Scaffold this motif. Structure first.
Motif, short mmCIF file in Angstrom:
data_model
loop_
_atom_site.label_atom_id
_atom_site.label_comp_id
_atom_site.label_asym_id
_atom_site.label_seq_id
_atom_site.Cartn_x
_atom_site.Cartn_y
_atom_site.Cartn_z
N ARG A 18 0.83 -1.20 0.00
CA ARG A 18 0.00 0.00 0.00
C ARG A 18 0.86 1.25 0.00
N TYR A 19 0.27 2.32 -0.49
CA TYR A 19 0.87 3.63 -0.45
C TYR A 19 0.60 4.18 0.95
N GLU A 20 1.67 4.45 1.70
CA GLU A 20 1.55 5.05 3.03
C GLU A 20 0.99 4.12 4.12
N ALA A 45 7.28 -2.19 -0.34
CA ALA A 45 7.47 -0.98 0.49
C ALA A 45 7.41 0.20 -0.47
N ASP A 46 6.38 1.03 -0.33
CA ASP A 46 6.15 2.19 -1.19
C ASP A 46 7.02 3.39 -0.71
N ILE A 47 6.82 4.58 -1.25
CA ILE A 47 7.72 5.72 -0.92
C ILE A 47 7.73 6.15 0.56
N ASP A 48 6.73 5.75 1.37
CA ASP A 48 6.81 6.04 2.81
C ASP A 48 8.01 5.46 3.57
N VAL A 95 9.78 16.10 -8.61
CA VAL A 95 8.96 14.91 -8.28
C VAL A 95 8.80 14.85 -6.76
N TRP A 96 8.70 13.66 -6.17
CA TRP A 96 8.39 13.47 -4.75
C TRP A 96 9.25 14.31 -3.76
N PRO A 97 10.57 14.34 -3.94
CA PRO A 97 11.34 15.00 -2.91
C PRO A 97 11.49 16.53 -3.12
N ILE A 128 12.84 -4.98 -7.03
CA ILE A 128 12.75 -3.57 -7.27
C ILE A 128 11.51 -3.23 -8.07
N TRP A 129 10.79 -2.23 -7.60
CA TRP A 129 9.61 -1.71 -8.27
C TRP A 129 10.00 -0.30 -8.78
N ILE A 130 10.19 -0.20 -10.10
CA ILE A 130 10.55 1.05 -10.76
C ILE A 130 9.30 1.80 -11.25
N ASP A 131 9.13 3.01 -10.71
CA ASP A 131 7.91 3.77 -10.85
C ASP A 131 8.20 5.12 -11.51
N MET A 132 7.14 5.76 -12.02
CA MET A 132 7.19 7.14 -12.47
C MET A 132 8.22 7.33 -13.56
N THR A 142 7.88 -2.64 -13.48
CA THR A 142 7.96 -1.33 -14.16
C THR A 142 6.60 -0.75 -14.53
N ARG A 143 6.49 0.57 -14.41
CA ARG A 143 5.27 1.24 -14.84
C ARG A 143 5.31 1.45 -16.35
N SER A 144 6.33 2.19 -16.79
CA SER A 144 6.48 2.53 -18.21
C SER A 144 7.18 1.40 -18.98
N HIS A 192 4.90 -5.87 -15.22
CA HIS A 192 4.19 -4.61 -15.33
C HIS A 192 2.95 -4.65 -14.46
N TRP A 193 2.58 -3.52 -13.88
CA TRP A 193 1.22 -3.44 -13.33
C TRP A 193 0.47 -2.31 -14.03
N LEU A 194 -0.86 -2.40 -14.06
CA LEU A 194 -1.67 -1.55 -14.94
C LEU A 194 -1.89 -0.13 -14.40
N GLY A 195 -1.25 0.20 -13.29
CA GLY A 195 -1.25 1.57 -12.79
C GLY A 195 -2.35 1.89 -11.82
N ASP A 196 -2.69 3.18 -11.76
CA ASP A 196 -3.57 3.72 -10.74
C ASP A 196 -5.02 3.59 -11.11
N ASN A 197 -5.54 2.36 -10.96
CA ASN A 197 -6.95 2.14 -11.13
C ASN A 197 -7.76 2.66 -9.93
N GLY A 239 -8.43 -2.20 -6.20
CA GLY A 239 -8.49 -0.86 -6.72
C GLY A 239 -7.63 0.04 -5.89
N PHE A 240 -6.72 0.72 -6.55
CA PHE A 240 -5.84 1.68 -5.92
C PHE A 240 -6.60 2.84 -5.26
N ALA A 241 -7.26 3.68 -6.05
CA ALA A 241 -7.93 4.87 -5.53
C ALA A 241 -9.28 4.49 -4.96
N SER A 253 0.02 -10.90 -9.22
CA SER A 253 -1.10 -10.84 -8.29
C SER A 253 -0.73 -9.99 -7.09
N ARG A 254 -1.18 -8.75 -7.08
CA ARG A 254 -0.83 -7.83 -6.01
C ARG A 254 -2.04 -7.01 -5.57
N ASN A 255 -2.36 -7.08 -4.28
CA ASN A 255 -3.33 -6.18 -3.66
C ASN A 255 -2.54 -4.92 -3.27
O1 LIG Z 1 4.72 5.45 -4.84
C1 LIG Z 1 3.51 6.21 -4.86
C2 LIG Z 1 2.52 5.59 -5.86
C3 LIG Z 1 2.33 4.10 -5.65
O2 LIG Z 1 1.53 3.90 -4.51
C4 LIG Z 1 1.56 3.80 -6.94
O3 LIG Z 1 1.38 2.39 -7.13
C5 LIG Z 1 2.54 4.44 -7.95
C6 LIG Z 1 1.83 5.03 -9.17
O4 LIG Z 1 2.64 4.80 -10.31
C7 LIG Z 1 1.66 6.54 -8.89
O5 LIG Z 1 0.42 6.75 -8.22
C8 LIG Z 1 2.78 6.87 -7.94
N1 LIG Z 1 3.11 5.61 -7.21
#
Ligand SMILES: OC[C@@H]1[C@@H](O)[C@H](O)[C@H]2[C@H](O)[C@@H](O)CN21
Ligand SMILES: *[C@@H]1O[C@H](CO)[C@@H](O)[C@H](O)[C@H]1NC(C)=O
Ligand SMILES: *[C@@H]1O[C@H](CO)[C@@H](O)[C@H](O)[C@H]1NC(C)=O
Length: 862
Positions: free
Chosen positions: A292-294, A320-323, A399-401, A434-438, A519-521, A532-537, A568-570, A591-593
């Protein structure tokens, strides 16, 4: 001109006769909705000048521009067609500027061709001179597959377009998008492609990845072909009911591949042969992932981990997300909120579990003598950032920081830098993947902290209908500079280059292990390196439904390890949705919740130690884990041969047109049919049962349905799972981790076909070593049943598992009572226990010990 065959000459504005006349096009405002009022005339475009020239590979032709209006700028007067007969099943052609070098994708896998034209071609190529057109036909039936003659060739410096007729409306592919259905709506539709941080929703925008591949099922025979455009510039794909497809790109070159196959699967195999077959994943990545995020604090994460572990949830991976980071900065952790992170890592590892950490490309430029930030200092020293257009000053975004610089992963040196950063961080927190994002790359400001200059890169003569309508939105300036070129040309390649560099880093950080990269992209070929995961559903019923074609499409693109954020993310997820989503989600190849920031908990055990949701989740996850040897073998075939893993019904049942648009069910490989309830309030699903014998997975009973739509009764605790008669499924008693599970007794499920026969295979290796396939350190075995006899054959036997694994159970479906069960080892005998259910027609053979890696014959009478 039949109006369905009109090729729109005004893609850039509301159609007018004045613009129509200025461009030399045809005007007819009297078609139906979306029929172009202004379309290209029948002669316009290019002509072949002189003769075609035979080469070793194929032929070349000189094309000369027939002068016309300069609409989207500087046109290309002399074009070179280079055609290469690369294999019996793969045709390659490219249109380039005869007198100027243009940007061409610097793909890591694909090599330039230096061969002779292949023999025994399944296709023929026909070139027309006046005006230019290229046609690719299937030799067997002369079915026209590719035919550019429907429209012009357009080739300006920043506007390239070629169209093709299509032999059918059975078109699957293109990305990344939420198409909502799997079979393309060949009605008038434009899909934009440009890697962008955007929401996968109902709007049909360009998303995180760039995937130009499509597959076409020609007819019920299974004959199918595919097309790949090797171009990394912004583009759009225009689909129309002719049926026809138009590729419209704003740079580079038209570098096309045409693949022929006898089945849809063979087309995917031909495509993946060219761009790169997916990595065999670590066997633990096939497990269930929780995220989860946070969580906010380590104590919060630990609390979630332990309630799910306390619930006996199959659960291999914690993300482990960006928190976890210190102020959202790479290669640190929060020494207060996440104090004791390394000790928690040891806890995970001792539980048999893995840690995946998120890492972002963008690096904080906030470093001083008094407060150094190593990743940035080390990166500046090495000079591996993306530069602004002056070519010397690192581009600054946000970006984040806060303010940040962006690694240039196209520079070989950047991977050295990246590797050392992971090395140093791994010494602190021993993460497993490693989960490469953004990594589009994504920017919270448009272009840079000071925007972008107005110029032809940032503001081109034509912009495809990308979200927001400017290239630089939420990313870098198009005139930004990198090793492989200007961002305009290589934007779509950032996530791909980052995946390549992250896998390089894994070479050092995890020596001789596969590890795991999410990877996202993506770009064509990213599956070689990453999942790959399908992003912010969003936690809606629409998003649950849209997950399925998105998963199937990435299996065509060779990224078979793909799924959404289950539940569902959001948004806060309703219990009923999350329950149905977890039932389905146990069968996504990835398979990821996962959950967004601030929303109510959606981890399975948060719904209650005794809840229907936790109980059902655990049940179907235990079924996923049972079938992991089957899933893993499917990944072995995706890696070694190029098969899909999550598979459309039509890939197995293409002879049956009722399966051609089915997108609410899918298969694991050839033999497991998954039928989710996808509708709110529902305890029924309207489902298609293909032309085969099917058995209920849990009871083993043969359904009476065959080749028909059905109302499948699926109460709140169920998802439809059926086994295909004719197939043998390897299983392994499940445990809460694959570390443990891989030491358990195996089993076989033999689902007999109408002829009382069945076939299957099993791949087995150490489950984590890189190169086990290339170096042939694996077991491959084959199971066949032909009345009264199961044979276990061993075709590759260069790995023996140290845990004394053996099939200790055989379940036979659709059988009459077996009697006199004999087990021979190389003809040498040797009585197993046999339990029989005469109502269900199921036999279970136990008290048996068939050593993994040994040949056996099991024989019985009736
Ligand atoms: O690390 C923060 C969030 C993650 O929770 C989310 O899965 C990912 C998305 O690509 C964007 O919403 C940004 N990232
Ligand atoms: C970026 O600029 C640095 C000098 O600051 C230089 O060493 C490096 O080669 C540049 N990278 C690119 C892609 O031009
Ligand atoms: C399942 O895993 C646990 C470790 O968590 C192990 O102790 C147990 O023996 C395993 N089950 C089997 C059948 O070996």
């Amino acid at each position: 001109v039949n109006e369905l065959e009109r090729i729109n000459c005004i893609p850039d504005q509301p159609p007018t006769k004045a613009t129509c006349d200025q461009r030399g096009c045809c005007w007819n405002p009297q078609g139906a909705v979306s029929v172009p009022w202004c379309y290209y005339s029948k002669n316009h475009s290019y002509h072949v000048e002189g003769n075609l020239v035979n080469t070793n590979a194929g032929f070349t032709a000189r094309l000369k521009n027939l002068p016309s209006s300069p609409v989207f700028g500087s046109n290309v007067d002399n074009v070179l067609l280079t055609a290469e007969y690369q294999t019996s099943n793969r045709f390659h052609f490219k249109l380039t500027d005869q007198t100027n070098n243009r940007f061409e994708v610097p793909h890591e896998h694909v090599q330039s061709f230096s061969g002779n034209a292949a023999a025994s071609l399944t296709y023929q190529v026909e070139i027309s001179r006046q005006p230019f057109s290229i046609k690719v036909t299937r030799r067997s039936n002369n079915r026209v597959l590719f035919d550019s003659s429907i429209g012009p060739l357009l080739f300006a410096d920043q506007f390239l377009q070629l169209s093709t007729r299509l032999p059918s409306t059975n078109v699957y592919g293109l990305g990344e998008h939420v198409h909502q259905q799997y079979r393309h709506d060949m009605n008038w539709k434009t899909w934009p492609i440009f890697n962008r941080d955007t929401t996968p929703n109902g709007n049909g925008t360009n998303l995180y990845g760039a995937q130009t591949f499509f597959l076409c099922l020609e007819d019920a025979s299974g004959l199918s072909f595919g097309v790949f455009l090797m171009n990394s510039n912004a583009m759009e794909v225009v689909l129309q009911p002719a049926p026809a497809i138009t590729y419209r790109t704003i740079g580079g070159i038209l570098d096309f591949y045409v693949f022929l196959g006898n089945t849809p699967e063979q087309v995917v195999q031909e495509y993946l042969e060219l761009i790169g077959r997916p990595a065999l994943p670590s066997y633990w990545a096939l497990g269930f992932h929780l995220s989860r995020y946070e969580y906010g604090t380590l104590d919060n994460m630990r609390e979630v981990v332990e309630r799910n572990r306390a619930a006996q949830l199959p659960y291999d991976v914690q993300h482990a997300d960006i928190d976890y980071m210190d102020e959202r900065r790479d290669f640190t952790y929060d020494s207060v909120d996440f104090k004791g992170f390394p000790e928690f890592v040891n806890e995970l590892h001792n539980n048999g579990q893995k840690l995946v950490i998120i890492v972002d490309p963008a690096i904080s430029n906030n470093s001083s003598s008094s407060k150094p930030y190593g990743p940035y200092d080390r990166g500046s020293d090495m000079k591996i950032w993306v530069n602004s257009s002056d070519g010397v000053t690192p581009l600054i975004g946000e970006v984040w920081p806060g303010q940040t610089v962006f690694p240039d992963y196209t520079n070989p040196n950047c991977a050295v830098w990246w590797t050392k950063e992971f090395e140093l961080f791994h010494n602190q927190v021993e993460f497993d993947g490693i989960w490469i994002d953004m990594n589009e790359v994504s920017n919270f400001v448009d272009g840079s902290v000071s925007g972008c200059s107005t110029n032809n890169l940032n503001n081109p003569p034509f912009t495809p209908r990308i979200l927001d309508g400017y290239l630089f939105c939420k990313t870098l300036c198009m005139d930004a500079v990198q090793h492989w070129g200007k961002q305009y040309d290589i934007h779509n390649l950032y996530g791909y280059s980052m995946a390549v560099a992250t896998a390089e880093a894994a070479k050092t950080v995890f020596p001789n292990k596969r590890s795991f990269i999410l990877t996202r992209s993506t770009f064509a070929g990213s599956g070689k390196f990453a999942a790959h995961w399908l992003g912010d559903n969003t936690a809606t019923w629409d998003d649950l439904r849209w997950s399925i074609p998105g998963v199937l499409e990435f299996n065509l693109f060779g990224i078979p390890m793909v799924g959404p954020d289950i539940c569902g993310f959001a948004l806060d997820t309703p219990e009923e949705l999350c329950r149905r989503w977890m039932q389905l989600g146990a069968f996504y190849p990835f398979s990821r919740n996962h959950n967004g920031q601030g929303y109510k908990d959606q981890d399975p055990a948060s719904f209650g130690a005794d809840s229907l949701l936790l109980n059902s989740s655990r049940h179907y996850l235990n079924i996923r884990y049972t079938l992991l040897p089957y899933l893993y073998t499917l990944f072995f075939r995706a890696h070694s041969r190029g098969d899909t893993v999550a598979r459309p019904l039509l890939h197995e049942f293409y002879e049956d047109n009722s399966t051609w648009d089915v997108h609410q069910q899918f298969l694991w490989g050839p033999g497991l049919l998954i039928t989710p309830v996808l509708d709110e309030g529902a305890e029924k699903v309207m489902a298609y049962v293909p032309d085969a014998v099917w058995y209920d997975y849990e009871t083993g009973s043969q359904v009476r349905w065959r080749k028909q739509k059905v109302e499948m009764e699926l109460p709140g605790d169920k998802i439809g799972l059926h086994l295909r008669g004719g197939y043998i499924f390897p299983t392994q008693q499940p445990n809460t981790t694959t570390l443990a599970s891989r030491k358990n007794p195996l089993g076989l499920i033999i689902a007999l076909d109408e002829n009382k026969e069945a076939k299957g295979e099993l791949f087995w290796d150490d489950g984590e070593t890189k190169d086990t396939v290339a170096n042939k350190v694996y077991l491959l075995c084959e199971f066949s049943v032909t009345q009264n006899r199961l044979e276990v054959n061993i075709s590759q036997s260069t790995y023996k598992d140290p845990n004394n694994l053996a099939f200790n159970e055989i379940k036979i479906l659709g059988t009459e009572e077996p009697s006199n069960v004999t087990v021979k080892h190389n003809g040498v005998p040797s009585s197993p226990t046999v339990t029989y259910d005469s109502n269900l027609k199921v036999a279970i053979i136990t008290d048996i010990d068939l050593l993994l890696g040994e040949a056996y014959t099991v024989e019985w009478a009736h």
